[PDB]
Structure 1
Amino acid sequence: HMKISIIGAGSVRFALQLVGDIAQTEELSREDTHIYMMDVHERRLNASYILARKYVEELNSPVKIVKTSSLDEAIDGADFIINTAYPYDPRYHDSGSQRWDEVTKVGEKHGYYRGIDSQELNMVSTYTYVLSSYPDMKLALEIAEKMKKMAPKAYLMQTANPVFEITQAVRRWTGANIVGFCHGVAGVYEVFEKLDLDPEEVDWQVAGVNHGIWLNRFRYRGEDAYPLLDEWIEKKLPEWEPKNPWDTQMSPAAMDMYKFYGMLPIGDTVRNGSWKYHYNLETKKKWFGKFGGIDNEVERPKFHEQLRRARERLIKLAEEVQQNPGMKLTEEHPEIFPKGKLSGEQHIPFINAIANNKRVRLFLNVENQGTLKDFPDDVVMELPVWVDCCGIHREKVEPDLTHRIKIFYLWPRILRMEWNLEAYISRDRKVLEEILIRDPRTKSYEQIVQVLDEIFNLPFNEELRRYYK
């Protein structure tokens, strides 16, 4: 049979997206397709399982849903393993976002605005946890080892962050068949809309690292289309206004980075700028608009609060369908349970390409292997690839990334990845300290020791503490 296992399936809205796409995919919506939903939180797991089955029935799909609390059962014989899990210490927390928010406050308590995990070219909230991302790296490596023995032919589709660090560590240290997934490339489509360009007429390409990708090719009617962006910057940027904290693709920060690097940063890359745009909230609002972006002391906690409420609402919704089995989820909540239209994420298209040879162009985190010849072959890059039955095939990156992107952006970010991996495998707190010694916000060595001490001493970091002892 076709076994697709979702690790961390309590991520309900994302689980239902995966389920909905599988049910609305002709080649996968079969009785021979088994979706395994696995999670450590019983309440969330059950809620997801109930909503998933009710959702599948309304879509009239014969795929069978199986829930399990055993990671081994989900991994055993799986064809594809989707890791969207966000570990947490259940003695003190209910989800993973809590540990990152709390340590971030300890960081700011010691003079590190937005926490020590916020660094130059690395501002995306909740991306790394205490630099080395111990609980997240640990789980990914555990799955990889269990996978090599129990599912030798499976693909580990890593979505939990940090995608870059994790995918690199698993590939380098286990040789497991892992691929990192993120749809940050989707930002290009707002560029085309703002410039009044039919996407189908645009010959474009992006490449870089996760949350560090650049519009290296942007052409229209047989010519470079960047002069059209120059015109927009001069005639329409002064009136740009963000629709919500997440709206940053066409922000002053994005264009200032374009002016310097020569290519437009795409997606979360705009969030991952130098400290020039992130010294404080006032600075963020100058460069990202009224909200100050999403990675600040106001919007980040607010967004995480919305997520918690959304979890409970969906839990209670699962109790509603059990009491009222006659309701139609697709009718009363069409947004959360779409019908007909696919989500647009890359996970299921990827599965449909490997399993059913439905060839598709995707943007995935895979080893360089000479694609960006100036970087090592084994470094995991976010590259344009065509996926089919027999492997993943990297496109040629043309034009190549600019000289400034390589020396001022890609390499510093690649080195930070290496710093973080070294901090994990070495189990040496001195590596963590060295990373903060390169941090602009550090004023003294004694400051570094103190912020790390308080972080390590938090009750829910007992495991992390013993790891580095």
Structure 2
Amino acid sequence: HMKISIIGAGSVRFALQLVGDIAQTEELSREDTHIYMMDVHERRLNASYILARKYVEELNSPVKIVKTSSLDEAIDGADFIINTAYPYDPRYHDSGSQRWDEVTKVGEKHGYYRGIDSQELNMVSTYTYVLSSYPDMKLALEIAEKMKKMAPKAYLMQTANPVFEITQAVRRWTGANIVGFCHGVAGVYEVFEKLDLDPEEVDWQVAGVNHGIWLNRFRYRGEDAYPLLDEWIEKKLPEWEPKNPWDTQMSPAAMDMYKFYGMLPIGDTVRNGSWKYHYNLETKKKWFGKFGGIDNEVERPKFHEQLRRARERLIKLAEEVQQNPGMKLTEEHPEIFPKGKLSGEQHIPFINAIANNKRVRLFLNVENQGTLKDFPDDVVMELPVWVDCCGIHREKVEPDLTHRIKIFYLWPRILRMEWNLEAYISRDRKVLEEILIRDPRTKSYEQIVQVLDEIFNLPFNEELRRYYK
């Protein structure tokens, strides 16, 4: 059979997306495809299981769906393990984002705007937790060790953040077959839209690290197409406005980074700039438009609440279907339960490529292996790759990333990953302190000790405190 396990299936909307794509994929929608939905939160998990079963039934897909609260059961003999879990202690929080929002508030209380987890080239909210991301790294490493014994052939498809740090740590310290997933590359198609270019006529490539990728190749009709971006910056940038807090691809911050680095940052990379664009909310609004981007004290909590409500709606909807077996989720809520339309995410296409030799081009976090020759072979990069029955095949990255991207962006970001990994494995608070000593917002050493003490002293950080004792 074929066993696909979603760890953290309590993440309802993502689980349903994964189930919808599987049921709408010919080579996978088979009675021999078993989808295990695993989580430690039964209310969330139950809702996801009920909605997934009904969704499949309305799609007339014969896939079998199994619910379990046992991590071992989900891993045992799995072919693909999708880690979308975001650990949180329910005694204190409703989601993982809620413990991040709390430590961040404590950071801001001590003078660290947007929390100590917001650093240069690393502003994406909820990416790291107290620098070392202890609970997320711990869970990923547990899964990696369990599957080396209970599922040696399985792919561990890491989606929970930090993808870069975690994929790197698992690869380096376990050798488990882990691949990091994030589709920040989807931003390029807007670039093409704004420049009036058929994306099918555009010869393009993107490369870098997770949330740190660059449009290294951008050609059209046999010539460099960046002069067309230059034209857009001059004529249409002054009139640019963000449609919502997430709209940053064509923002002044992206184009300023482009002017400096020589290539356009893509996707979340525009959020991960230097402190030039993020000193405060007013500065964010100059470089990102009226919302100030997403990673600020207004929009990040707002967005997290929108997720909380959206989650409860789905849970309530799961109670409704149990009461109204006749209602068709495909009809009542098409945007959540689409028919005949794939999500476009890479997770299920990846599985169909490995298991059914359906070759496809994807952007995945894997070891460099000389793809970017100026960087170590074992450093995990977000690279363009072709996946099929027999492995992941890296494309040649040409043109190479510019000299400035390497020395001012990729390398400082790679070192931060190494800092974070060292802080985890060493169990040494002094490494956490050294990271904050490189932090521009630090005014004194005593400040560093006190912000960490309060974070470590939060009631839901007992494990973290004992870990670093």
1:196-239, Cα deviation, whole Å (9 max, x unpaired): 00000000000000000000000000000000000000000000
1:324-344, Cα deviation, whole Å (9 max, x unpaired): 000010111000111101000
How far is the alpha carbon of 1:90 from its aligned partner?
Answer: 2.2
Q: Residue 142 of structure 2 corresponds to which residue in structure 1?
A: 142
Q: Residue 90 of structure 1 corresponds to which residue in structure 2?
A: 90
How far is the alpha carbon of 1:91 from its aligned partner?
Answer: 2.1
With structure 1 as the length reference, what TM-score do the two structures score? Answer: 1.00
For residue 292 of structure 2, give the secondary structure of its aligned residue in structure 1. Answer: coil
How far is the alpha carbon of 1:105 from its aligned partner?
Answer: 0.3
Q: Residue 37 of structure 2 corresponds to which residue in structure 1?
A: 37
1:407-439, Cα deviation, whole Å (9 max, x unpaired): 000000000000000000000000000000000
1:355-385, Cα deviation, whole Å (9 max, x unpaired): 0000000000000000000000000000000
How far is the alpha carbon of 1:95 from its aligned partner?
Answer: 1.2
- Quote the Cα distance in structure 2 between the aligned partners of 1:95 and 1:243: 27
- Quote the Cα distance in structure 1 between the aligned partners of 2:311 and 2:90: 16
- Quote the Cα distance in structure 2 between the aligned partners of 1:97 and 1:219: 39
- Quote the Cα distance in structure 2 between the aligned partners of 1:279 and 1:147: 43
- Quote the Cα distance in structure 2 between the aligned partners of 1:262 and 1:93: 43
For residue 418 of structure 1, give the secondary structure of its aligned residue in structure 2. Answer: helix
Q: Which runs of 5+ in 1 are unaligned?
A: none
For residue 129 of structure 2, give the secondary structure of its aligned residue in structure 1. Answer: coil
Q: Residue 286 of structure 1 corresponds to which residue in structure 2?
A: 286
1:376-409, Cα deviation, whole Å (9 max, x unpaired): 0000000000000000000000000000000000
For residue 204 of structure 1, give the secondary structure of its aligned residue in structure 2. Answer: strand
1:308-359, Cα deviation, whole Å (9 max, x unpaired): 0011100000000000000010111000111101000000000000000000
For residue 361 of structure 1, give the secondary structure of its aligned residue in structure 2. Answer: strand
How far is the alpha carbon of 1:109 from its aligned partner?
Answer: 0.1
- Quote the Cα distance in structure 2 between the aligned partners of 1:49 and 1:260: 48
Q: How does 1:150-229 map to 2 (within 5 A)?
A: 150-229=150-229
- Quote the Cα distance in structure 2 between the aligned partners of 1:210 and 1:352: 23
For residue 342 of structure 1, give the secondary structure of its aligned residue in structure 2. Answer: coil
How far is the alpha carbon of 1:284 from its aligned partner?
Answer: 0.1
For residue 246 of structure 1, give the secondary structure of its aligned residue in structure 2. Answer: coil
- Quote the Cα distance in structure 2 between the aligned partners of 1:272 and 1:96: 21
How far is the alpha carbon of 1:453 from its aligned partner?
Answer: 0.3
- Quote the Cα distance in structure 2 between the aligned partners of 1:119 and 1:83: 25
For residue 117 of structure 2, give the secondary structure of its aligned residue in structure 1. Answer: coil
- Quote the Cα distance in structure 1 between the aligned partners of 2:42 and 2:164: 30
1:88-107, Cα deviation, whole Å (9 max, x unpaired): 12221121111100000000
For residue 111 of structure 1, give the secondary structure of its aligned residue in structure 2. Answer: coil
Across the two proteins, how many residue pairs are aligned to each other? 469
- Quote the Cα distance in structure 2 between the aligned partners of 1:173 and 1:24: 36
For residue 3 of structure 2, give the secondary structure of its aligned residue in structure 1. Answer: strand
For residue 434 of structure 2, give the secondary structure of its aligned residue in structure 1. Answer: helix
- Quote the Cα distance in structure 1 between the aligned partners of 2:183 and 2:245: 18
- Quote the Cα distance in structure 2 between the aligned partners of 1:337 and 1:10: 17
- Quote the Cα distance in structure 2 between the aligned partners of 1:385 and 1:114: 34
How far is the alpha carbon of 1:295 from its aligned partner?
Answer: 0.1
1:73-100, Cα deviation, whole Å (9 max, x unpaired): 0000000000000001222112111110
- Quote the Cα distance in structure 1 between the aligned partners of 2:305 and 2:95: 12
- Quote the Cα distance in structure 2 between the aligned partners of 1:251 and 1:338: 32
- Quote the Cα distance in structure 1 between the aligned partners of 2:287 and 2:302: 20
For residue 169 of structure 1, give the secondary structure of its aligned residue in structure 2. Answer: helix
How far is the alpha carbon of 1:274 from its aligned partner?
Answer: 0.1
How far is the alpha carbon of 1:193 from its aligned partner?
Answer: 0.2
How far is the alpha carbon of 1:283 from its aligned partner?
Answer: 0.2
- Quote the Cα distance in structure 1 between the aligned partners of 2:320 and 2:445: 55
Q: Residue 322 of structure 1 corresponds to which residue in structure 2?
A: 322
- Quote the Cα distance in structure 2 between the aligned partners of 1:123 and 1:97: 15
Q: How does 1:76-115 map to 2 (within 5 A)?
A: 76-115=76-115
Q: How does 1:47-446 map to 2 (within 5 A)?
A: 47-446=47-446
For residue 362 of structure 1, give the secondary structure of its aligned residue in structure 2. Answer: strand
- Quote the Cα distance in structure 1 between the aligned partners of 2:345 and 2:109: 38
- Quote the Cα distance in structure 2 between the aligned partners of 1:89 and 1:343: 31
How far is the alpha carbon of 1:192 from its aligned partner?
Answer: 0.2
1:25-55, Cα deviation, whole Å (9 max, x unpaired): 0000000000000000000000000000000
Q: Kindly, what percent of the aligned residue pairs are identical?
A: 100
- Quote the Cα distance in structure 2 between the aligned partners of 1:195 and 1:221: 14
For residue 4 of structure 2, give the secondary structure of its aligned residue in structure 1. Answer: strand
1:265-292, Cα deviation, whole Å (9 max, x unpaired): 0000000000000000000000000000
- Quote the Cα distance in structure 1 between the aligned partners of 2:95 and 2:196: 42
- Quote the Cα distance in structure 2 between the aligned partners of 1:200 and 1:93: 46
- Quote the Cα distance in structure 1 between the aligned partners of 2:46 and 2:228: 51
- Quote the Cα distance in structure 1 between the aligned partners of 2:29 and 2:193: 34
- Quote the Cα distance in structure 2 between the aligned partners of 1:89 and 1:35: 26
- Quote the Cα distance in structure 1 between the aligned partners of 2:154 and 2:186: 27
- Quote the Cα distance in structure 1 between the aligned partners of 2:103 and 2:189: 35
- Quote the Cα distance in structure 1 between the aligned partners of 2:219 and 2:285: 31
* CA RMSD across the alignment: 0.3
1:248-281, Cα deviation, whole Å (9 max, x unpaired): 0000000000000000000000000000000000
- Quote the Cα distance in structure 2 between the aligned partners of 1:60 and 1:279: 53
